[PDB]
# Entry
Amino acid sequence: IVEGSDAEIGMSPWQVMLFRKSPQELLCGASLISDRWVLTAAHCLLYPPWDKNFTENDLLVRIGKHSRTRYERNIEKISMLEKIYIHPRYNWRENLDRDIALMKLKKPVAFSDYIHPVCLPDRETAASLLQAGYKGRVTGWGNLKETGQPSVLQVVNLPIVERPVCKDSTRIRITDNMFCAGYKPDEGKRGDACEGDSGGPFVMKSPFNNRWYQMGIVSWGEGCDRDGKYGFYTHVFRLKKWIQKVIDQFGE
Amino acid sequence: XXXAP
Amino acid sequence: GEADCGLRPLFEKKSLEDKTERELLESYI
Amino acid sequence: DFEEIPEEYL
# Structure
């Protein structure tokens, strides 16, 4: 995250850390959607061009974290994946289209002041909140600067931008499974996700029922916080029918 | 979030 | 767990607000 | 610069 701040304690209790067993290391962000399931970007697990193809075994899930680096002795819980599911039509070849994956935990986690799930949007909720101008919030332990790593979880509030402008800022082909967010060079406010923030949640708070909803997943971008550039996220509501599906077939 | 992604 | 979803134990549940959530709610015109 | 996690996790 570029131009954000440290999160307050328990500000984002669905925030999950994707963690490598050896070298033990931060892979990506992700989010708690129930006591057994985690939501992240598919490219966090499968990205052939970087020779990336992680297995259930390659990792751990860290929930309830604040500190990037410390092992939060009575706060955080570490879990093991029972399985990984990637959107069958996720496109690593041309533009990270359908950048989405689900992870089923070996054992259901217990919620706490620091551990609590995010809601998935319904058609009406998405209908009304995914509007150009409306702000969302992103969190992650990622790069602070395009060129480093924070000590604590970072947060930023960013406005959704019109598809036209999103499309006109880049050479890459944008699909309906993506939305972009950031400020306009004239709006004079900064911030963005950045390398290492991948897989993290872009959430909105409903004004109707005052619940926090997850609308996007941190996907890709061009540099971090550059004028005329915007962060791109996986449009969670559009890939919902796929999510429903796998949960209904493989668990809970 | 990696090194584009 | 998604049922008590999106109500944070240290904010919503105690009816305390975080430092910038008001910026969000204000953008929803 | 990651602090060690409990063997029990690995």
